[PDB]
Amino acid sequence: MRRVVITGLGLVSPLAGDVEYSWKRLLEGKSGVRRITEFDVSDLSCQIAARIPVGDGTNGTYNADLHMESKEQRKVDAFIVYAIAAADQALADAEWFPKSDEDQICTGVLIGSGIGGIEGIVEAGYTLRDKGPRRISPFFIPGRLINLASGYVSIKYGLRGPNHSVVTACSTGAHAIGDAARLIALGDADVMLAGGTESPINRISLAGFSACRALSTCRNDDPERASRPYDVDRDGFVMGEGAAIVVLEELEHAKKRGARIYAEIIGYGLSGDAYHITAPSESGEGAQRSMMAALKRAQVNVSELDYINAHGTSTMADVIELAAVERVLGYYAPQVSMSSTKSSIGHLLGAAGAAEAIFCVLAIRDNIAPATLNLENPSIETKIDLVPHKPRERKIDTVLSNSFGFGGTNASLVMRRFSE
Amino acid sequence: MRRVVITGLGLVSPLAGDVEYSWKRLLEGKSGVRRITEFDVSDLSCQIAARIPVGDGTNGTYNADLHMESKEQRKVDAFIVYAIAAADQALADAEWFPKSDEDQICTGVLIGSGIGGIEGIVEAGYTLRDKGPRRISPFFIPGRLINLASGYVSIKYGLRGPNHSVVTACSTGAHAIGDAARLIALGDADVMLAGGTESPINRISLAGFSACRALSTCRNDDPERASRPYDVDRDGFVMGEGAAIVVLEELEHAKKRGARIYAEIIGYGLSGDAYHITAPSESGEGAQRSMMAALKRAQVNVSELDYINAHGTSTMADVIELAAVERVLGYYAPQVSMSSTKSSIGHLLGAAGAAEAIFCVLAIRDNIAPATLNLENPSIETKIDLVPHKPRERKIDTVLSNSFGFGGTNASLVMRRFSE
Ligand SMILES: [K+]
Ligand SMILES: [K+]
C-alpha cells in the first residue's frame, strides 16, 4: 500500500464560506446556529439551523455565483453547488489543476451526500401534479442524483480518474475520505478530491427529522445554546449545511512536485451496529470496533493519541460514544482531548465527517483542540478532557475522528503529522 | 491481498422473484418488459417497463410478504424490500447465517441504489403541502435513505461487519461488488453481502427520464421489442426494477467451511469521463480505461477473455461501447462473445451491475452466453459475436462486465472460474 497525504482543504460551512475563516471563527467560540429566516418555519417544532453566511464573498461570506453561473445553479440542488465551491478551494489550496492526459487520468473524485436532492424532488413532484409531465425539466434527474456532485466537479476540472460516490448518512464524509485514500493506496489514482456535501435546510427535511424526534426543539429563542454535546440539557441535534473537500495525494507524487503536506491519513475503520434503523446501539460496541479497527490499520497505540473529534451530535447517544471511547483509551483517558465541533456548526449530515476531518488536520497544524461549546453541566463525569467552552492549546500529532450514521453505519479515521 | 470468491446468489428481477427462475427464463429468450398497469401512464411518452412478476411466490413469482411484514413494508420504499428479499436468497444459497460474535462481526453489507426513495419523498411532499408538517410520518427519513437498505439487511441478519453504501447511477451495483471485494481482500471483513437495488418505476421517475429523453417511446404497443441494444431501430432504454445481491467470501474461509464456490472476483476498474452530465464520452476513452484497468488488476490478457456483459442500454451510445471494446480486444475480437441482457430485463439502474454480475457467474457455471434479444439489424458490423436472438453455448472461464453510469462514472469487473 502506498502512503497517502492531504495537500489541500476546502470548506463551505455555517461559520464561513472558506477554510481559514471557518477555523478562525471556530476557535473564537463562534456559533453558526440561528433562527431560520429564509422560509416559513412557524409551523415546525425546530426553527433553527446552522447556516452558511451568504454574501459577496468578502469577510468570509459565501457567493454561489463565483462558483457556478446563476442559470446553472437553477438546474441543480444546492448540495451540488456547495461541492463545486469546496472543490474550487481545495484544488487551489493544493495548487493542482491537471491539464495533461496523464495528470487528468490519475486524478479522481469521490464526493458523497446523505440525502442529496430532496428539496428538488419535492418541488418536481408539485410540478408533476400541478402542471403535468411536459413541464418536468430535462435537468430534473441529473440535478438530483447524489453522484452528480462528483460528476459536476469532474467535468469542471477535467478529472478523469475514479469517479465515485457514497451515501451513509452521518458517516458519509468519513467513508468518502477513507475510500478515496484506499483508491490511491491501491494505485487506482495518484490524486483524489474527497469529501461530502449536504443541503438539508428545507421544510421537507426539517419536518422529516422533527417527525422522528431527532432535532433540538426547546431553544428556538436561544439558538446559539441549542447544540450542546454531553450537556445534561441537550435535546437533539441542530441541522447544518455545507461541503467539505480535501485533496488526497500519493506521497511520492506530492514530494516530487513540492506540495505542502498538511497531514497523513494512516487509518480507516468500518463497522455496523445491526441494532436499529435510527437509534445507536446501547452498548457502543460498534463504535468501539470502528475505532479499534482504524487504530490497528494505522498501527497506532492509544498511548499515542492526542485528540479525538467526536461524533457527538447533542443527542442522548452522546454518552454511549463517550463510554466507548473510555473503554478504547483505558489508562490513557486523562491524556487525550476529545471534542464535538457540532457544538459550533451543527450536524452537517453527509458533509459532517469531512468537515471534521478538516478540523482534525488544522488541529495538527495549529496544535490546538477545538472546544465543545455549551458544555455547562456534563451528564456524566469522565477522565477525558472534553475541552468545554474554549479551545485547548496542546501537542497534537495523532488524531482520531468518529462518524456514526443512521442505520448503524460507523466509520473512524486516523491521521497524523507528516514528518516522513 | 486475500482472494475473494462468490458463494451465494440472490436476485429479484423482471423475469422472476429468484435467481434460478430468472436465469431459466433469460436463456429461454423471455422478456420482462410490458405495458404499465399499476398506475396511470396515459400522459407519459413511455408507458412500458420491466416489472417483477408479483404473486404468491410460486412459479417464480415475488411475494414481498414473505420477506417483510405488511405493516413494515408500509414504512419503507420498495428498494429496501427488494434488497431484503435478494439478501434472504443469497444467504440461504451461501448457507451463511452468522450467530456467534466472531461470525457476525466479520460479515458486512454493502448495498447501493442509484436513486433510492424518490417515490416516497414525492408522496411526503404532497402530505407536507396538503396536510402539514405534523402529518409527516416518523418513518419518513429512515424508509427513504439509500443506506437503509444495508441497514435493514444488517439488522435482520445480525451482520456487524462493515456497513456501507454507494450511489453511482447505472454503475452502482458494480461499484458495490468491487468495493465489497476489496474490503475482504484487505482484511476488513471475511464475508460481505454486496449488490444493488432499485424501485424507479413510478410517475416522477418516468417523467424525469422521459424529460431528458433517455427512455424508449416508439414501442409502447410492442413492449417486448422496445429494448434492442445495438439495433438500428433502438430509441432509448426501458426502465426496470429489482435487486441483486451476492455473497462474497475470503477464499480460505470458504474452503474451510466447505462452501460451494461459483467463481472468483479477480479484477475491478474505475474511471471518469469528465464529459457530460448524462451523455457518455463520444470517444469511449473512459470506458476503455475502465476495462483496461480491470483487466490489468486481474492480470488477464484479452486473449483469455470469453464473455463480456455489456452496459448496452439500447441508446445511441451502444455503439460507442462497442467501438471501445473492439479497441481493447484488438486481434482477439472474433474469439469473444458479448451481449446485453438489458435486452431482456431492461435497465435496472442501481441494481443493473449486480444483476449482470450474477448473469456472468451463471454464464461460467453453465458455459453459456446470454443473448442480445431483438438484434435484427445491427447499426454497424463487428467481428465481435453479439449473440443475437438466442444464447450461445461455449467455453466460458473468464468474464468481463461493464457499467457506465450517468455522471460519467465507469466500472468494470473481471471474474473467473475457480479451480484453485
Ligand atoms: K467526528
Ligand atoms: K454489464
Label residue A390 exposed, middle or buried (CB < 10 Å: 0-12, 13-18, 19+).
middle
Resolution for this PDB entry, in angstroms: 2.0
Give the span between the Cα atoms of B344 and B15, in whole angstroms.
Answer: 8
Q: Minimal Cα distance from A278: which residue of B?
A: B142
- For residue B350, give the nearest of B206, B121, B176 by alpha carbon: B176
User: In chain A, which among 10-39 make CB contacts under 8 A with chain B?
Assistant: none
CA–CA min distance A43, chain B (Å)? 7
The DSSP 8-state label assigned to residue A147 in this structure reads T
Q: Hey, is the C-beta of A55 within 8 angstroms of any chain B C-beta?
A: no
The DSSP 8-state label assigned to residue A137 in this structure reads -
Q: Hey, is the C-beta of A129 within 8 angstroms of any chain B C-beta?
A: yes
Q: Left, alpha or beta for B373 (phi > 0: left; psi -120 to 50: alpha)?
A: beta
Give the span between the Cα atoms of B306 and B337, in whole angstroms.
Answer: 6
Q: Hey, is the C-beta of B105 within 8 angstroms of any chain A C-beta?
A: yes
Give the span between the Cα atoms of A187 and B206, in whole angstroms.
Answer: 39
* CB-nearest partner of A147 from B150, B168, B183: B168
Give the span between the Cα atoms of A84 and A382, in whole angstroms.
Answer: 41
CA–CA min distance B392, chain A (Å)? 34
Asked about B106 being catalytic, the answer comes back as: no
Q: Left, alpha or beta for B51 (phi > 0: left; psi -120 to 50: alpha)?
A: beta
Give the span between the Cα atoms of A374 and A389, in whole angstroms.
Answer: 6
Give the span between the Cα atoms of B79 and B84, in whole angstroms.
Answer: 9
Helix axes A285-298, A318-329, angle to 10 degrees: 40
Residue B211, H or E segment: helix B203-211
Q: Which residues contact A317 (CB under 8 A, 6 or more apart)?
A: A279, A280, A404
Interface test with A, best of B160, B217, B281, B289 (most A CBs within 10 A): B160
Q: Which residues contact A151 (CB under 8 A, 6 or more apart)?
A: A142, A145, A163, B277, B406, B407, B408, B409
**Beta-carbon separation of B163 and A410 below 8 A:** yes
Give the span between the Cα atoms of A243 and A240, in whole angstroms.
Answer: 10
Q: Which residues in chain B have Cβ-Cβ distances shorter than 8 Å to A162?
A: 270-272
Whether B44 and B203 have beta carbons less than 8 Å apart is answered as yes
Give the span between the Cα atoms of B62 and B199, in whole angstroms.
Answer: 14
Ligand number with the minimum distance to the CA of A309: 1
Total number of residues shown for chain B: 420
All domains of chain B, ordered by start, with CATH?
5-267 (3.40.47.10), 268-420 (3.40.47.10)
Q: Which residue has the cell 442559470?
A: A71
Give the span between the Cα atoms of A285 and A288, in whole angstroms.
Answer: 5
> Which grid coordinates are listed for A230?
454531553
Whether B389 and B371 have beta carbons less than 8 Å apart is answered as yes
A107 bridge partner residues:
A191
Rounded to 5 degrees, what angle do the CA atoms A289, A290, A296 make? 85
* CB-nearest partner of A162 from B126, B140, B271: B271
Give the span between the Cα atoms of B23 and A43, in whole angstroms.
Answer: 53
* DSSP string over A112-133: E-SS-SHHHHHHHHHHHHHH-G
CA–CA min distance B162, chain A (Å)? 4
CA of A174 relative to ligand 1 center, distance in Å: 8
Residue B112, helix vs strand vs coil: strand
**Beta-carbon separation of A407 and B142 below 8 A:** yes
CA of A248 relative to ligand 1 center, distance in Å: 19
Give the span between the Cα atoms of A32 and A15, in whole angstroms.
Answer: 5
- For residue B279, give the nearest of A151, A137, A73, A162 by alpha carbon: A151
User: In chain B, which among 172-191 make CB contacts under 8 A with chain A?
Assistant: 175, 179, 182-183, 186, 188
Q: Which residues contact A243 (CB under 8 A, 6 or more apart)?
A: A10, A11, A12, A79, A82, A83, A85, A86, A111, A195, A196, A197, A198, A351, A354
Whether A78 and A67 have beta carbons less than 8 Å apart is answered as no
Q: Hey, is the C-beta of A147 within 8 angstroms of any chain B C-beta?
A: yes
**Beta-carbon separation of A277 and B155 below 8 A:** yes
Give the span between the Cα atoms of A236 and A223, in whole angstroms.
Answer: 13
A10 φ, ψ to 5°?
Answer: -140, 140
Helices and strands (DSSP H and E) totals, chain A: 13, 14
Whether B239 and B350 have beta carbons less than 8 Å apart is answered as no
- For residue A81, give the nearest of A119, A108, A36 by alpha carbon: A119
Give the span between the Cα atoms of B230 and B377, in whole angstroms.
Answer: 8
Strands B263-272 and B4-12: antiparallel
Give the span between the Cα atoms of B259 and A350, in whole angstroms.
Answer: 38
* DSSP string over A256-274: HTTPPP-EEEEEEEEEE--
CA of B171 relative to ligand 2 center, distance in Å: 9
Q: Which residues in chain B have Cβ-Cβ distances shorter than 8 Å to A407?
A: 142, 145, 147-148, 150-151, 154, 163
Q: Which residue has the cell 475473494?
A: B4
Give the span between the Cα atoms of B255 and B260, in whole angstroms.
Answer: 8
Helix, strand, coil percentages, rounded to 5, for chain A: 35, 20, 40
Q: Which residues contact A214 (CB under 8 A, 6 or more apart)?
A: A236, A237, A278, A315, B141
> Which grid coordinates are listed for B280?
457518455
